[PDB]
């Protein structure tokens, strides 16, 4: 009886820090809903070179990572984006199929294609170009 831990509020207080970080745990950053709204509504319409900021990026917002398999996580993000976006946007939030294992399968399917063959770094390229050499692929980071 003494060796028992009861959980009441910790069920809904701990996975809530993703949405209200500055109040529950004091991390002085923004919530997930507010970051998604900042990107969808204030940066992407102001970026030249793309056609439709709400009509394209809202077609597929899906959730990938391991810290996602909580009950009712996509619905919270959908209600937040529904509160932020204009009325009539075809919002459809879904998730990946194998959330903790698709990060491996995507690089498994990518590994032996022509873009990957055009993005490798061989040994003599490491001997010549140096150490911090970046083949600019559309998935990797920015070249330097």
């Amino acid at each position: 009886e003494t060796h028992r831990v009861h959980l009441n509020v910790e069920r809904i207080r701990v996975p809530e820090v993703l949405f209200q970080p500055a109040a529950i745990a004091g991390v002085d950053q923004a919530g997930l809903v507010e970051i998604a709204g900042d990107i969808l509504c204030q940066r992407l319409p102001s970026l030249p070179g793309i056609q439709d900021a709400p009509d394209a990026f809202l077609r597929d917002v899906f959730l990938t990572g391991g810290n996602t398999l909580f009950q009712n996580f996509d619905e919270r993000l959908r209600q937040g984006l529904m509160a932020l976006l204009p009325v009539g946007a075809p919002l459809r939030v879904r998730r990946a199929q194998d959330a903790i294992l698709d990060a491996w399968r995507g690089a498994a399917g990518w590994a032996c294609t022509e873009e990957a063959k055009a993005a490798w770094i061989t040994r003599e390229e490491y001997l010549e170009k140096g150490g911090e050499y970046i083949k600019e692929h559309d998935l990797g980071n920015a070249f330097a």
Partner: protein
């Protein structure tokens, strides 16, 4: 009044699921025999360098072969007179001199003496008795010194034909057959939001939140340390709080109404 706990049912209790070991040592050599049978250019070893679980396998399959934490541990026994060093899941979490390859709280590798032995365990348990290409994951906007040190360990220590770095969430995007969207990926170290426009990541404006599953575990440990205030007779590890979070936490839909009437007696 005896009513509020007279007809109350007996409790349904759940035990502790601590991340222990598991009784398996496979020296799997049946993958190299299939890898040497394929034509060249279509054989590569893919390593997901995850902060919670480094995964590794061959590209022509669907499940990864090795899925281990970056835990290693080295010892010296004077009662036996021998130096031990095993790594991965073979550590039991009875002895623990555990240090991790990832820095606690950030998915940037800065403990290279651990990462070298982790990669050593990977290449041993895959089977290397002798030169395949390597596709390896990293974090978003990685520091250049970490990439330099990782490339130096790949070329100089082991000897590899080629390696290429990529972002694992974007690989899971490309496997999920998307073209243009908003990838939100909550990892073990940080939660990234990355806009992708026609199979191209717009990394000039992606934003990472500094919260993750490790922060879930540590904050859960702090709240169970401060809830049970007068002293709890029990070892409060971080990993058992992580397994509490994995199966006893859910994001509530309407938080400010659910929260204020949560600790009522009725129910």
């Amino acid at each position: 009044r005896d009513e509020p706990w007279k007809r109350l049912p007996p409790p349904t209790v759940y035990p502790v699921k601590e991340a222990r070991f598991e009784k398996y040592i496979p020296p799997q050599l049946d993958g190299r025999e299939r890898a040497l049978a394929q034509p060249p250019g279509q054989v590569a070893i893919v390593i997901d360098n995850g902060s919670h679980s480094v995964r590794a396998g061959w590209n022509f399959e669907d499940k990864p072969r090795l899925a281990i934490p970056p835990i290693m541990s080295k010892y010296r026994d004077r009662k036996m007179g021998k130096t031990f060093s095993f790594a991965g899941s073979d550590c039991y979490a009875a002895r623990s001199h555990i240090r991790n390859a990832f820095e606690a709280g950030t998915g940037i590798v800065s403990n290279w003496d651990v990462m070298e032995h982790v990669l050593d365990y990977v290449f041993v348990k895959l089977g290397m008795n002798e030169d395949m290409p390597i596709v390896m994951t990293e974090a978003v906007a990685n520091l250049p010194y970490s990439r330099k040190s990782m490339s130096e360990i790949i070329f100089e220590c082991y000897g590899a034909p080629s390696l290429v770095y990529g972002i694992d969430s974007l690989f899971s995007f490309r496997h999920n057959q998307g073209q243009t969207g908003l990838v939100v990926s909550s990892s073990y170290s940080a939660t990234h939001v990355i806009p992708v426009y026609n199979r191209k990541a717009l990394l000039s404006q992606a934003i990472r939140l500094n919260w993750g599953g490790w922060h879930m575990a540590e904050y859960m440990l702090k709240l169970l340390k401060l809830k049970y205030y007068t002293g709890f007779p029990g070892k409060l590890n971080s990993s058992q709080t992580e397994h509490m979070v994995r199966d006893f936490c859910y994001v509530s839909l309407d938080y400010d109404r659910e929260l204020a009437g949560y600790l009522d007696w009725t129910g």
